[PDB]
Design a protein around this ligand. Structure first.
Ligand SMILES: Nc1ncnc2c1ncn2[C@@H]1O[C@H](COP(=O)(O)OP(=O)(O)NP(=O)(O)O)[C@@H](O)[C@H]1O
Ligand SMILES: [Mg+2]
Ligand SMILES: [Mg+2]
Lengths: 317, 684, 181
């Protein structure tokens, strides 16, 4: 499936990853994951392997082979994997979650011995890699965000709102752009700058962008650094234009009959193409495709029986 | 003091003012109390100020001279205050005991104490004789002599109130303790016409009937088997088996012991031979054969225990069946101002209660013809319950003296707790209370409602819940909550009432009782509170709690499944209140109780400090956390923070309604409830 | 059995207090005369002479009759009850009917269909007139659970004040100041 960009991958509480065609709705293949649920999916820069974050393990699958074996399954962690990220050369992998550490694997080794790990004193909700630079941004349940220098172990501590946890972060490919969200209804945008020094600085506050959606669960930027999308536990998703952070549009799955409302949470989204489509997950048991430019709908994928949370796809081949 | 505080420049000025006030009116209790307390505070002040720097012996000599300057008149002050009042002298008595135990070895404090003690009515010591007892081992002969003389004098006048804890003390495994106890009991044998022997007879037979040979061999072999086959701890296994065989070696005395011996003795002796063969040769296979024998014994015992429903005294304790007016007071009551109710007879048989553990019901007949029902239970240390009941007594007294709490009839229901040994005792029976769990179970059964609907729904949505992340658990929890109306209790409270005029009052008592225990449990630090620990009074509507074990915040640090909720306030409990919710009666009652607790802080601290530093109980907390003196200090500081409005943050001082609102929010948020162990059912 | 209704029908003819008391007495006796159980029949001769004896067994007799009568007979009886409840402010009759309704609420048959809304509003008003404040409160909360209005909230304040519990009224006021203007 790695060879054809049309294939989208979804996962949820059915203990399987399903691969289907974005523009036809035809299901093409499945991968079994009976050991646990999947917390996150990701595709390597090599466009030929997909990772899945499960319970007490991180597992790799071959996206070209017809025998999706656990290629180099990293059996460890012992509690939870919040997310899995990859470095751009395909050499390193980054993990958050529990125990409260940011652990980095040197993926070519067959051992789980790591060359670096950062101790954090609350569970880690998200880990991001700075574009084109060996630095991590780690979001914790304590409300703190830490920046770690992968080359020196130096760091910076950011605690903009100690009362609430950080729930998600994503740093735009454009090194000057944000962002992260917390559990109480607001997104923060600070200017990215810095220089040479021991402390891994500097962020300079720019604007506070309220959502008023009780969360959010996921913050994500488009490939063209133009759009910012936010998904929450509520039945909506909002998209702002980064040139001024004004609201451009809004997506919603709310029921038209309140008696059957709150069918499920919008567990994240992803941009596809040059800001052409949004691939959305939903706990109500299907995936949906939306157009960012018009709001035109709808394509659906309902191969699952239980709630669907994770998204991944071959955006480029 | 309020404007400047306490420091080296203010102490003598406040003391001068208090001294002048005392001289102006020498009969006024408050003047003497305030002076004695200020001197006590000065003693702690100088000790604290030196240790604060030394740890973070010329100094010791400087402290001895300075503290003696303060301490002797502090003792005299407290003694005078005690002599000027009755009934409410508990706090002063405890402070005297504190100064005595810590500084009594100094000749000047000793002299002050001797003159003090001679001048005090002997009856005022009765309120403090679970604390003088078990300090008799103090390695300070001066204090030892004082304790022994005081206890002897007390026994001379009120032996009925003393014989119980001394009888228990005489069974202690520490040489010094049972020896001192024996000396005191020997004096009592002369003073009480050998009442001591009757007390020992009853205590020993009562202890023996609590636990049978079948139960001891069942648990013993279960643990020894775990050690042999699981851990492979052969040494530990032998250590576990050893006392069981040594116990059997004394031979049977009762009919049950004889039957047990006839049924299992041979096989146990063969097992002994196999173990000895292992010990001599090292042949573990001999232990395997011994374990086959133990297995057969264990299995046969496990078939039979569920069929035991009652015991007759003729087979376990014929000595009790044949009684006789024993000249002993009924264990649950004694009042020096009333006639003593004597034990007239013991019920011919005991009823066994089947559960994970098996308490037995006893009934005694007294000299007044009344029945007294006690619950006899082994395998537990009841001294914690005794101390908690004493605290509750104090709290009820403090509430009784506030007109607001007289108009709003607030109180805490208490129990009778009587330890018999380190692992057994009696609990008073409360005749009309029903466990909350049973009430809900029976309701759902009558209506054909499955007991676990919420759980089944959660599993159907996501049949892996136990291993999900926080936000997933929140989603599933809220879904299940929103799929059913949690108001079974609200319906039960109405269906069981004879009329609206009764229902209304019952609901009022329910709400106020819950608010009172919410605030007291918070200050105490009461831990695990789940549907099997709370009971409702079938007639009055008041709420009881029956398991005062993990009474401090050690119940917030268990290895698995916290323990985030400061007190239980579930949706089913809130729905039983007025249709407006928590606002109103509940919140206001919490405000009133917290204000009373804050106003009288020093009495509460005196009792809690006396408990925390008790060398025989404090270990229950030591095993969990940290130098015990440091942890005990941290615990006291935490209590003071709770009682001074500095619990949530040490950088501010919160008002009563602010603290209460913060506590309610913490106790209701879904994020904390979703983390609780399923046994502590968060959706009930 | 049908005779039970024939006396009930008198509640469109009675005018004076004595007329209504006689109506109630006649109904009470007829409910016993033709009862379905030998344990209730046999006291009729006694009840006829023992005045309170009929009263004390009124509810039990009614329930037995209730399970016998069909839908048309029950409709006629309910209409008779509604008329008795509205025709005149006689405390003995109003209190008897209120006690009957309360007893029926605890039965395995369910509440009387004193339409509309099972008579919750009507019984409430009558409870207020009889100074049965606990009942007025119960019925007011029952209608509250169907959706709040300012009228209900003010009624709750009034009843809570009459019962001498200012704290409950304060709770209602805070509710109003959180959800309503
Ligand atoms: N005063 C009391 N009055 C009536 N019943 C009581 C009373 N105290 C305890 N019980 C009941 O008798 C049993 C008490 O057993 P017990 O072992 O003491 O409680 P528990 O829940 O197991 N607490 P613990 O074992 O210490 O963790 C329970 O079935 C109680 O319902
Ligand atoms: Mg138990
Ligand atoms: Mg017990």
């Amino acid at each position: 499936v790695g060879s054809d960009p049309v294939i989208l991958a979804t996962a949820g509480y059915d203990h399987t990853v399903r691969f289907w065609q974005a523009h036809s709705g035809i299901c093409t293949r499945t991968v079994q994951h009976q050991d646990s649920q999947v917390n996150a999916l990701e595709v390597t820069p090599d466009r030929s392997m997909i990772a899945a974050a499960g319970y007490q393990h991180i597992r790799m699958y071959d996206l070209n082979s017809n025998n999706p074996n656990p290629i180099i399954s990293y059996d460890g962690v012992n509690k939870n994997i919040a997310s899995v990220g990859f470095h751009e050369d395909g050499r390193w992998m980054y993990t958050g979650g529990e125990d409260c550490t940011a652990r980095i694997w040197d993926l070519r080794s067959r051992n789980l011995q790591c060359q670096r790990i950062f101790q954090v004193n609350a569970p880690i909700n998200c880990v991001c890699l700075h574009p084109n630079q060996a630095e991590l941004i780690v979001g914790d349940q304590s409300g703190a965000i830490h920046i770690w220098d992968l080359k020196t172990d130096h760091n910076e501590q950011l605690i903009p709102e100690p009362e609430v946890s950080i729930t998600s972060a994503h740093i735009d490919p454009d090194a000057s752009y944000m962002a992260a969200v917390n559990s109480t209804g607001n997104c923060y945008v600070w200017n990215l700058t810095g220089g040479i020094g021991d402390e891994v600085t500097q962020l300079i506050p720019k604007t506070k962008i309220p959502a008023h959606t009780r969360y959010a669960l996921q913050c994500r930027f488009s490939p063209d650094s133009t759009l910012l999308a936010t998904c929450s536990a509520d039945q909506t998703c909002k998209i702002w234009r980064t040139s001024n952070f004004s609201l451009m549009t809004e997506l919603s799955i709310k029921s038209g009959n309140p008696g059957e409302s709150s069918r499920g949470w919008m567990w994240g989204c992803a941009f596809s193409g040059d800001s052409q489509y949004i691939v959305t997950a939903s706990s109500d048991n299907l995936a949906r495709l939306w157009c960012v430019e018009t709001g035109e709908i709808k394509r659906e994928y309902g191969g699952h029986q239980k709630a669907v949370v994770c998204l991944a796809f071959n955006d480029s081949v | 003091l309020n404007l400047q505080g306490i420091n080296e420049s203010t102490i003598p000025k406040v003391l001068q003012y208090y001294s002048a006030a005392t001289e102006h009116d020498r009969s006024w209790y408050k003047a003497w109390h305030a002076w004695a307390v200020m001197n006590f505070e000065a003693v702690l002040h100088y000790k604290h100020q030196n240790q604060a720097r030394d740890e973070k012996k010329k100094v010791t000599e400087d402290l001895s001279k300075t503290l003696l300057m303060y301490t002797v008149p502090a003792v005299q002050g407290f003694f005078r205050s005690i002599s000027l009042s009755r009934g409410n002298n508990l706090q002063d008595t405890l402070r005297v005991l504190t100064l005595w135990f810590d500084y009594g070895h100094w000749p000047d404090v000793n002299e002050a104490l001797v003159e003090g003690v001679k001048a005090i009515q002997i009856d005022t010591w009765l309120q403090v004789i679970p604390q003088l007892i078990a300090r008799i081992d103090t390695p300070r002969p001066l204090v030892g002599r004082l304790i022994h003389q005081l206890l002897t004098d007390i026994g001379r006048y009120h032996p009925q109130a003393l014989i119980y804890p001394l009888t228990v003390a005489s069974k202690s495994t520490t040489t010094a303790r049972h020896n001192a106890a024996n000396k005191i009991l020997k004096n009592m044998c002369e003073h009480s016409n050998t009442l001591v022997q009757q007390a020992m007879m009853v205590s020993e037979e009562l202890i023996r009937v609590a636990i049978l040979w079948h139960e001891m061999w069942h648990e013993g072999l279960e643990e020894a088997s775990r050690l042999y086959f699981g851990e492979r701890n052969v040494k530990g296994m032998f250590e576990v088996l050893e006392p069981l065989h040594a116990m059997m070696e004394r031979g049977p005395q009762t009919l049950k012991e004889t039957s047990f011996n006839q049924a299992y003795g041979r096989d146990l002796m063969e097992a002994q031979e196999w173990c000895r063969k292992y010990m001599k040769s090292g042949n573990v296979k001999d232990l395997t054969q011994a374990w086959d024998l133990y297995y057969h014994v264990f299995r046969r015992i496990s078939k039979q225990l569920p069929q035991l429903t009652s015991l007759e005294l003729q087979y376990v304790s014929p000595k009790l069946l044949m009684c006789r007016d024993l000249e002993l007071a009924v264990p649950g009551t004694y009042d020096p101002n009333q006639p003593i109710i004597r034990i007239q007879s013991i019920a011919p048989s005991l009823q066994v209660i089947t559960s994970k553990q098996r308490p037995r019901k006893l009934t005694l007949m007294g000299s007044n013809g009344h029945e007294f029902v006690f619950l006899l239970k082994g395998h537990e240390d009841l001294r914690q319950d005794e101390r908690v009941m004493q605290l509750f007594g104090l709290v009820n007294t403090l509430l009784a003296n506030d007109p607001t709490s007289l108009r709003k009839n607030l109180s805490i229901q208490r129990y009778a707790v009587i330890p018999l040994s380190t692992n057994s005792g009696l609990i008073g029976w409360v005749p009309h209370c029903d466990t909350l769990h049973a009430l809900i179970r029976d309701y759902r059964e009558k209506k054909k409602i499955l007991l676990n609907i919420e759980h089944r729904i959660m599993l159907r949505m996501a049949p892996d819940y136990d291993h999900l992340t926080l936000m997933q658990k929140v989603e599933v929890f809220e879904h299940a909550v929103n799929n059913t109306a949690g108001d079974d209790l609200a319906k039960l409270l109405w269906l069981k009432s004879p009329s609206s005029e009764v229902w209304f009052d019952r609901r009022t008592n329910y709400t106020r009782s819950l608010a009172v225990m919410s605030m007291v449990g918070y200050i105490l630090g009461l831990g695990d509170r789940h549907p099997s620990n709370l009971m409702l009074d079938r007639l009055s509507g008041k709420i009881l709690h029956i398991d005062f074990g993990d009474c401090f915040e050690v119940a917030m640090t268990r290895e698995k499944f916290p323990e985030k909720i400061p007190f239980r306030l579930t949706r089913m409990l809130t729905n039983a209140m007025e249709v407006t919710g928590l606002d109103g009666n509940y919140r206001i009652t919490c405000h009133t109780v917290m204000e009373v607790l804050r106003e009288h802080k020093d009495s509460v601290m005196a009792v809690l400090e006396a408990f925390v530093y008790d060398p025989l109980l404090n270990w229950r907390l030591m095993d969990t956390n940290t130098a015990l003196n440091k942890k005990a200090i941290q615990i006291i500081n935490r209590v003071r923070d709770k009682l001074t409005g500095r619990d949530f943050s040490h950088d501010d001082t919160l008002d009563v309604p602010t603290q209460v609102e913060l506590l309610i929010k913490q106790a209701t948020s879904h994020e904390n409830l979703c983390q609780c162990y399923i046994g502590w059912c968060p959706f009930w | 059995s049908t005779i039970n209704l024939q006396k009930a029908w008198g509640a469109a003819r009675r005018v004076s207090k004595d007329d209504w008391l006689e109506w109630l007495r006649r109904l009470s006796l007829e409910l016993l005369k033709d009862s379905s159980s030998p344990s209730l029949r046999s006291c009729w001769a006694l009840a006829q002479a023992y005045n309170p004896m009929a009263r004390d067994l009124f509810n039990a007799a009614f329930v037995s009759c209730w399970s016998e009568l069909n839908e048309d007979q029950q409709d006629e009886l309910i209409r008779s009850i509604e008329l008795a409840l509205t025709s005149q402010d006689i405390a003995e009759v109003t209190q008897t009917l209120l006690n009957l309704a309360e007893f029926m609420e605890h039965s395995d048959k369910g509440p009387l269909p004193l339409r509309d809304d099972n008579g919750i509003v009507l019984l409430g008003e009558r409870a207020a007139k009889c100074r049965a404040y606990a009942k007025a409160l119960h019925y007011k909360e029952l209608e509250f659970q169907k959706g709040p209005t300012p009228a209900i909230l003010e009624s709750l304040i009034s009843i809570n004040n009459k019962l001498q519990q200012p704290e409950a009224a304060a709770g209602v006021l805070e509710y109003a100041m959180k959800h309503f203007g």
